[PDB]
């Protein structure tokens, strides 16, 4: 059972500028007083990061199904702990495994599991009538859970889930990415006293976890905790007041950065190579300060964005059944040789029936046989 | 003016030889990045590159 | 019923060569429409790569598909679908110089694109694919043409001074006093 | 798996196992152990408890798992999640006789 | 092989080794007694005959 929200006042998506944010340690190695260069998935500096927020009095509570593109930077400003989980997946329909990270006010649970997700899930909060406190009697995320291959129910705890009014006090920044079946989460919590968009400052996001989920992720959404008390009218689809929190989503891209490790081993400053010519010069010279002059600078500014394939248009499937499914092979001394031309070497047809004890390829990587065209093809057959 | 012409010729010849030297395999299967990266995945292409 | 080492094994050896001649045996890929004059990753008959494709004129004998230059990098390719020759060029070029007063003074900079006319700077630099912060230094009101190339980010000054930051072709740049970078012909 | 496919458990391989079921990276530090399991996983009349994916839209990423059982559209028409002509159940069963 | 001495370094809980500019490991956390030890070469240049 799960309820879909009906009261919505929606605006076009808002944008802001992410400046010198989203830098994380790329390894578990201690380096002190060193200017280290790296390349990885990073949030480009001064990027148009998308803004979402839940505030009441205009009854927005925004939480769409955003896309996941080989890494995401998430950053939430909150005081009452409204933004309290994430859902990741490829379709979020129970036809595929999906990841669920939820802090249900007592435990943080991570499940990789076939979930029949709601359409607008919310984790819920409720100002109880039998006792003057906050605790929640509603957990509206998923309707079913089958074939469930991961679990990180943590030790119990208690948190100030109350609704505080005033100025933000916590900025929590997360970097998610999915590499080789490993979901890497880097985290940083900092106290801030600002009611604006992203603050001024450099962060040093530390590695939190390296979960082995081994799934395909292309979309996500955030799980927001509904406020609900005795001062709001209507039913569950109308009787709820929004939170007072905000988050920002970026999009990591492959970029080369310079990083500075101080004497104590922490990252304090960085340069986004291929941002502007000045950063390009800092990056080519491998320093944070450039003296007066003119510098020849290397080529990092342009990066590719699309791929083109241009193959001959041939439709005749290649005679796999004549060399492999041959009634009779040749003696090894009079080994048969067959010319092969005008083919489409799909070779997935052989998966159905043919199993090969040895399949060794020389001069070619086997993985690249799908991305090649072969000129002078001869099949030498024998027993 | 053989001296000045010799200077200019030396510089141009050095640059042209530097361009010509890109045809050497240096032990790799080919002297072209594209051929290496197409025939082999990064698995085996890292050593050649 | 004899041992596994004595059991019969059927063997086939598929011999071929790659990326050296016209190809008729293709993989199970689906082609894509041709995008010319753009930094793009291409894959012609299995020869992958990245660069800029343009049209040209070359006489290719029927047994030739690829063409190679002095450096041995492939430079001309015959498109298998539409029989024509396309030239591959790098989608960037050297010749970008960054002029700056030293940090601890300011973060303003100027960019000298060498041996390019100021009308054709964006196509040469591919400013369409560049970041927004690189595009402001690609075209504007401070664009100045010189014998060395096009200078962007510094206003041209008819006055002459001593050389502070040499640029080339008798042009020197400096940091005036609002604060900005100036470019002027040197005073001998 | 079956014996003939044990060679596929290695970096930079291709086949049913190395494309649709279990993929290894080439930045792969670690190692692979395989031993014959006849008369332990094979019973008279054929053991069909072990399955393998036969059709997939695209190859797997390294250390990626795919337990979905959605019907694979091989041809042009969508068959709408029911087995039929030109649609196959992607999972097939190993027949392990002793 | 080298010379082990004691030193002061702030190692975050997910860090065990430390590397210098030359990339050779220079600081190691002793697994048994949780402390940081610095490795130095057990010789030095500067001997003239
Ligand atoms: C949701 C997943 C989740 C993660 C990844 C998580 C990580 C996490 N949260 C922590 C503290 C904490 N974490 C929270 C709350 C949160 N922290 C969050 O990441 C989120 C989303 C909230 C809720 C909105 C609070 C209130 C503290 C203690 C802060 C304090 O005592 O000052 C700590 C430090 C624990 C320690 O130092 O002993 C970790 C590692 N906690 C979670 O619940
Ligand atoms: C991960 O999931 C996505 C979405 O299903 C897959 O990408 C799609 O694949 C289908 C064909 O199977 C295409 O029709 C879509 O156009 C693809 N969408 C995008 C954005 O690429 C993707 O193939 C899956 N990844 C793996 C390794 O299987
Ligand atoms: C009719 C033969 C066409 C020859 C095409 C030549 C090269 C391109 C295809 C190469 C691989 C041949 C099929 C081997 C399948 C091994 C998969 C497996 O079971 O592990
Ligand atoms: C929410 O309402 C029902 C379930 O209560 C669901 O079927 C429907 O798809 C949802 N409405 C919208 C607009 O998605
Ligand atoms: C939700 O909080 C309750 C507190 O009793 C806890 O029992 C439960 O483990 C939490 N949810 C999950 C899925 O663990
Ligand atoms: C996946 O869930 C369905 C639901 O019945 C079940 O039939 C199937 O056996 C499950 N497969 C695995 C690998 O758990
Ligand atoms: C490094 O750590 C010590 C103790 O925590 C502290 O005194 C010092 O200020 C730190 N270094 C810098 C530059 O702050
Ligand atoms: C090869 O022979 C087997 C058994 O007859 C058959 O199942 C299979 O479909 C054939 N495959 C090809 C490519 O001919
Ligand atoms: C197919 O190939 C032919 C020549 O090989 C070419 O003329 C044609 O444009 C290609 N595309 C289609 C749709 O036929
Ligand atoms: C480009 O510059 C050269 C020399 O400065 C000149 O000959 C040529 O006409 C210019 N072309 C255009 C379109 O301005
Ligand atoms: C993206 O950022 C650039 C500045 O870097 C800005 O000019 C542009 O308007 C932004 N576009 C959007 C859609 O936010
Ligand atoms: C410099 O002199 C030329 C003509 O002599 C004039 O067109 C130009 O406006 C002068 N530069 C400035 C900044 O006025
Ligand atoms: C064993 O390990 C502990 C901590 O890991 C350490 O305090 C102790 O000295 C070690 N040796 C013995 C004999 O316990």
Residue numbers in the entry:
A (entry chain A): 14 to 70, 76 to 401
B (entry chain C): 945 to 993
C (entry chain A): 500 to 676, 689 to 699
D (entry chain B): 402 to 499
E (entry chain B): 549 to 597
Sentences from the paper on this structure:
The spike (S) protein of coronaviruses is responsible for interaction with cellular receptors and fusion with the target cell membrane. The S protein of SARS-CoV-2 is a large, 1273 residue, type I fusion protein, that can be processed by host proteases into two parts, S1 and S2. The spike (S) protein of SARS-CoV-2 has been observed in three distinct pre-fusion conformations: locked, closed and open. To overcome this challenge, based on the locked SARS-CoV-2 S-R/PP structure, we engineered cysteines residues replacing positions D427 and V987 to generate a new disulfide-stabilized S protein S-R/x3.
